[PDB]
Amino acid sequence: HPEFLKAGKEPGLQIWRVEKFDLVPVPTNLYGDFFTGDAYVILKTVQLRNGNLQYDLHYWLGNECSQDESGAAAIFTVQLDDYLNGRAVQHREVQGFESATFLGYFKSGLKYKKGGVASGFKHVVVVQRLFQVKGRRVVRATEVPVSWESFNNGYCFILDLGNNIHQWCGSNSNRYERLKATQVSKGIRDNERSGRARVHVSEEGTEPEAMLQVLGPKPALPADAANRKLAKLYKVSTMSVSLVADENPFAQGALKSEDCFILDHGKDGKIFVWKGKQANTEERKAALKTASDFITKMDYPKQTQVSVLPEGGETPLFKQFFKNWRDPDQTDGLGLSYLSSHIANVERVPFDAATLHTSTAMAAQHGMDDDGTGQKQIWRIEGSNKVPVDPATYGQFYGGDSYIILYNYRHGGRQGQIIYNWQGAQSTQDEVAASAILTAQLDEELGGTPVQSRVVQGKEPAHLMSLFGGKPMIIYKGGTSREGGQTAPASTRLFQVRANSAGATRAVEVLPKAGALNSNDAFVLKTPSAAYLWVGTGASEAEKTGAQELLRVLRAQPVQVAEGSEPDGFWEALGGKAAYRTSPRLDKKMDAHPPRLFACSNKIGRFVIEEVPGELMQEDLATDDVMLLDTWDQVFVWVGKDSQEEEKTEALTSAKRYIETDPANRDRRTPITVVKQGFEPPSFVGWFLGWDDDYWSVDPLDRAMAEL
Amino acid sequence: PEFLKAGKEPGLQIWRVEKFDLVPVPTNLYGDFFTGDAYVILKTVQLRNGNLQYDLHYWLGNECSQDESGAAAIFTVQLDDYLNGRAVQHREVQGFESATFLGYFKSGLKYKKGGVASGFKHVVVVVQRLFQVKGRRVVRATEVPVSWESFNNGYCFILDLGNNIHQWCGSNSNRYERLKATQVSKGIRDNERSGRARVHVSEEGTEPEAMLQVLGPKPALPADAANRKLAKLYKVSTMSVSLVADENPFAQGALKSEDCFILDHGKDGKIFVWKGKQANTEERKAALKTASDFITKMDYPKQTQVSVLPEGGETPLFKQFFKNWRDSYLSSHIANVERVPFDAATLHTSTAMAAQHGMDDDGTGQKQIWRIEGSNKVPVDPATYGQFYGGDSYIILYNYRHGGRQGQIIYNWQGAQSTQDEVAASAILTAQLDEELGGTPVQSRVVQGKEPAHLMSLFGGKPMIIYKGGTSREGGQTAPASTRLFQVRANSAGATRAVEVLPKAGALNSNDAFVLKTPSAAYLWVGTGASEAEKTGAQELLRVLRAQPVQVAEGSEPDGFWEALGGKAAYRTSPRLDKKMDAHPPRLFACSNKIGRFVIEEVPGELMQEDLATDDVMLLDTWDQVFVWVGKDSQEEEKTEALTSAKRYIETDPANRDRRTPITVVKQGFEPPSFVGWFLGWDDDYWSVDPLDRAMAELA
């Protein structure tokens, strides 16, 4: 097919409109408008860092689409995928409920237009149209009858009169949605009228005569998270299904190459169809029909999103339904199966302490706002008070205590502060609770500006490891460093020793079993007789240096041992034999779990989150929102200055619920880091290309209305 | 009296030969030469161990007397004698001077009209001179008559009026040569007028009145590689010559200490005269006159350069005409380079160590490896990263970190038994992926058995294993040979490579560990010179080979070991060179293929960023690898022939270099550490503002 040979040769986006079983290219300046009476085929081509190309195939159905037009677009999707050697991820998209990654391709917004090929309409490049504009992250302009009846005071509308474009904002429309509706107006101006058209903004009671002349005289106008965590897995075999796993996280083994699978997430709006390598081609080529039959049989809504993945090319959202997804490539290669397109343009900068003060990009990508060298104060929580820790023992933390670390960070030409609230795993509830309140209290003392990070024992963020000079972070199971009473330590104790990109190490005590070992780390097991230093295959320089800087304060003397080839007195101290972690971990962690940005809300007594599609942009931080920025290691909570006071005070709780509902069954101990608008740390800012320190000095909407 | 001041410390001294006397030139005027006179130039480089090394040059102007020229020749022979015959002598002629002579003056040369005979002196006044400035790397400013007729629109000119110095640039003058002519202008300012002068730059049509007052109203103005590879060797015996070897590389044995020899390279502009220790004092002291007679008898241009060397004090340039020269000299453009030994811990801090060891980083970065099957890249099994079959060709995309900076290297490895189509396809696929990644990754073509050090260091602790032929592609696994030999070498970093070789004794080498594999057992031979990593590397190979080693030392090893080899024979026991920098210092050349003919011009003296012209393609020949530097504003076909220009540079080298020598293409502004580290004074923002824009606003 003539357009097939133009398909996906370079990185880019291509949109064809399905016209009487033919693919007709949509003019590029009109990308984002869709005739609701037609169907379209969208090919996103992404370059994969090693130069290869990755394909996301979407077909889109309008509400007034034919069934043969809808069929044509699906047929084209199968055969385009076929022509590109089956490596594409396919997506069925339905007007109004389209996936986030489709939505990422159009961040000027979407325009749903009345008409279709059946009614004689074309993407040509004299007007009188009216659009209802809805949406906060996902902006949609629906064509509506030109009548005051289409209007309501909740939203913004665009009355398009050709050379003049009338954006009208309802009185009860909030000012962020006005800024988004302005994108729509500006688009029509610059893309449909190629700049030579005037945009007139107006509120109610200030409508121009042009607007009242077509619309007449204005009358009076009118004005979730629970469902995410559970999914199930099915094998497909007319077609019928057998249930292979009724609760996630799933076994990656359940996916057999000989068959195809349906991962049902339909109470949350999505099903995946996984195509196995060795499944027969008749079944694979019918992966779209299989899916829609599934949606009908389970009485799911017809808008449900569908993605078909090929084996070896799965997306991160898909794979995170499974416990510990791995491939051979994994450690060797430079990337994984899929590259989430909203981080595809991010240059990866590995850690370099010397230049750390230069690169927010490195701060963000490595969770280090600085080198850890700043002045810091540490307290221990005793009863209802903070007690200064002995500076001699900075770096040691007992699991029966809770601490507060006030730390001053310098990076670039700015100063800021972080309050770390470390909560031991055996600290009593009253003292843990007290540490959380004292953290907030000292946040308010310092003007509400410092970052607050709640971290619990055994999941310490990288930045926290690097505060203690060269000394490692030592984390006892453990007892109490409070002056009242120190326990005699356990008979035999083992310490897992981890490093970070910065080189800093921490030694965290865990129970003395073989099941707690790890190839990637150095361990220190202490027995009555002597002192060991086990050193894994994966272990490196910093991990051993760190492991015997521990051995000095332990008042012990090392007997170094490599993994696998070891004395057996060490395996007596362990009490026997079991398998342990030998697989490496991910610099690829960004690829497996790219950062995602969500808004979230607490009323209707119900927690709701909305993901923001596409590239992380400062513009998506609405000052009347609380946002979640989910780095895999850390969930930042960004609190807008004009969000509700209840929303502000439940910042932590919002994140906790975000994590408790994640279908990935995330770690209950995942650190949460609250940050204030205009006081964001490097680790947060660096995820946003184009961040601007004076972005909020002028109101974003005042800016974009004098700006045009 | 002047002899006793000669060559006591490192430095440079220039005398003017004035009526058979040596008269020192004032130091602020070093670089100026009267065209009617001759000079004697002594470069005193501190050899590298505390001793002193002497390069003696005498220079003849175009209007030099014949008694003046003779005086300077006499002085050259007698200074050498006074300095214990250990100097290298050079005959230099105005306009055709050697590269190392030019190295002493990279502000440029001034040829001035006049000499002793016409009553002129190096005084340090009322002036009105005009200089034509010509030259791209070697810049020479010839004094010319003060007239518009001396002007041409190709070049830059300097009208020196004393307190005012008028540098004039032709319409059709290139802006890099503008940058070089301003060096001359400021040189006059800061050295002849001791700073006390204005330099005024002007182009055609914008000449000041000062300039049109002297010159009148402006009228209309006007506007190799084959020869290097062959040389011959002669014995000298009036004098006549015997031909001792009519084609290089030469036998070093051919130089007998009792005679003198002429190595003829005169089709390339140079002859050497080699003085044997035990040759008689009459023949040695007449080596220059012998040379000139040879030049006359073979009807070479009188401009031909001549160097006479003493045995044991030969030049690297001279010794590379010989096969395996064994057994002084320090190229003075490598003489101030502090040599930094390898320390992986601090590798990221020192460009210098990166350059001197061919290591952009430790090799631990993220990498992807493909094998070429047909016209496509197919990913190699990650289990087998590090193994390369000689029937295949591969592409390695590697991510390197150094300083606080990132870059990329695409290695295109071409097996010795790979089909031409697949090799060609590998070469096209590397260029395509370079373009796909923005044109910035360095591209290094390596041929099997000549892997650069950095490539060995990519595979963890594992060594890079290189099989003779076969293919890791899914189509066909041939059963390997019954008996197999593997040469195991290490690099400065500790990394190892195991290169399969023919199973001969003549293929062994004392410096390395070897692995001979037989049906019965697996050996691990260990040379005298073999060291710690070579054994470590050699026994991880025995692991991959599904075999278990029987270790054996050199010289004293079983007789079952050598039945597998098919007998015994002599092999390589000679050690290798950290001294390689000294035997083969890096050299920088420009090159061009215009007029359908390949031409190179060496850039003299200390390697400096500024000599990287953005409209040139440059070759930096590290002995191990030839970098080719592509300036952003060079012509499109020169860019696309970067690889091929380096290939012909190597095929025409009189050193008879390995055709498998790696070639590494690197782009202006994206140079890797291993390249950058050779230019002390390199600056990451040098090209952020145009060099001539700076050097026109600079000072002015």
Swiss-Prot record, chain A:
Sequence positions bearing Phosphothreonine: T670
Please list the residue ranges covered by the Gelsolin-like repeats: 21-103, 139-211, 246-318, 384-465, 505-571, 609-684
Positions with a binding annotation for Ca(2+) 8: D624, D625, E647
The consequence of D625N is: Does not result in actin depolymerization activity in absence of calcium. Has actin depolymerization activity in absence of calcium
Q: Which domain of life is it from?
A: Eukaryota
Q: What is the effect of changing E647Q?
A: Does not result in actin depolymerization activity in absence of calcium. Has actin depolymerization activity in absence of calcium
Q: Which cysteines are joined by disulfide bonds?
A: C156-C169
Which species is listed as the source? Homo sapiens
The protein's matches in InterPro entries, at most eight in alphabetical order, are given as:
ADF-H/Gelsolin-like_dom_sf, Gelsolin-like_dom, Villin/Gelsolin
Residues recorded as binding Ca(2+) 5, renumbered to this chain, are G400, D401, E431, T480
Stated name of the protein:
Gelsolin
Q: Where does Ca(2+) 2 bind?
A: D81, G86, A88
- Gene coding for it: GSN
The UniProt record gives the binding positions of Ca(2+) 7 as N520, D521, E543
Implicated in which disease?
Amyloidosis, hereditary systemic 4, Finnish type: A form of hereditary systemic amyloidosis, a disorder characterized by amyloid deposition in multiple tissues resulting in a wide clinical spectrum. AMYLD4 is due to gelsolin amyloid deposition and is typically characterized by cranial neuropathy and lattice corneal dystrophy. Most patients have modest involvement of internal organs, but severe systemic disease can develop in some individuals causing peripheral polyneuropathy, amyloid cardiomyopathy, and nephrotic syndrome leading to renal failure.
User: What role does it play?
Assistant: Calcium-regulated, actin-modulating protein that binds to the plus (or barbed) ends of actin monomers or filaments, preventing monomer exchange (end-blocking or capping). It can promote the assembly of monomers into filaments (nucleation) as well as sever filaments already formed. Plays a role in ciliogenesis.
Gene Ontology annotations of biological process type: actin filament capping; actin filament depolymerization; actin filament organization; actin filament polymerization; actin filament severing; actin polymerization or depolymerization; amyloid fibril formation; barbed-end actin filament capping
What does the UniProt entry list as the effect of changing T142I? In a breast cancer sample; somatic mutation
Q: CDD domains given for it?
A: gelsolin_S1_like, gelsolin_S2_like, gelsolin_S3_like, gelsolin_S4_like, gelsolin_S5_like, gelsolin_S6_like
Q: Which residues bind a 1,2-diacyl-sn-glycero-3-phospho-(1D-myo-inositol-4,5-bisphosphate)?
A: 107-114, 129-137
The protein's UniProt keywords, in alphabetical order, are: Acetylation, Actin capping, Actin-binding, Amyloid, Amyloidosis, Calcium, Cilium biogenesis/degradation, Corneal dystrophy, Cytoplasm, Cytoskeleton, Disease variant, Disulfide bond, Metal-binding, Phosphoprotein, Repeat, Secreted, Signal
Q: How is it modified after translation?
A: Phosphorylation on Tyr-31, Tyr-338, Tyr-394, Tyr-532 and Tyr-580 in vitro is induced in presence of phospholipids.
Impact when changing E177Q: Does not result in actin depolymerization activity in absence of calcium. Has actin depolymerization activity in absence of calcium
UniProtKB/Swiss-Prot annotation, chain B:
Residue sites binding Ca(2+) 6 per the record:
D434, G439, P441
State which tissues express it: Phagocytic cells, platelets, fibroblasts, nonmuscle cells, smooth and skeletal muscle cells.
Source organism of the structure: Homo sapiens
Carries keyword Secreted? yes
- Related disease? Amyloidosis, hereditary systemic 4, Finnish type: A form of hereditary systemic amyloidosis, a disorder characterized by amyloid deposition in multiple tissues resulting in a wide clinical spectrum. AMYLD4 is due to gelsolin amyloid deposition and is typically characterized by cranial neuropathy and lattice corneal dystrophy. Most patients have modest involvement of internal organs, but severe systemic disease can develop in some individuals causing peripheral polyneuropathy, amyloid cardiomyopathy, and nephrotic syndrome leading to renal failure.
What result is annotated for mutating D616N?
A: Does not result in actin depolymerization activity in absence of calcium. Has actin depolymerization activity in absence of calcium
Where does the chain bind Ca(2+) 5?
Answer: G391, D392, E422, T471
Q: Where does Ca(2+) 8 bind?
A: D615, D616, E638
Q: How is it modified after translation?
A: Phosphorylation on Tyr-30, Tyr-329, Tyr-385, Tyr-523 and Tyr-571 in vitro is induced in presence of phospholipids.
Q: What is this protein called?
A: Gelsolin
Q: For binding a 1,2-diacyl-sn-glycero-3-phospho-(1D-myo-inositol-4,5-bisphosphate), which residues are annotated in this chain's numbering?
A: 106-113, 129-137
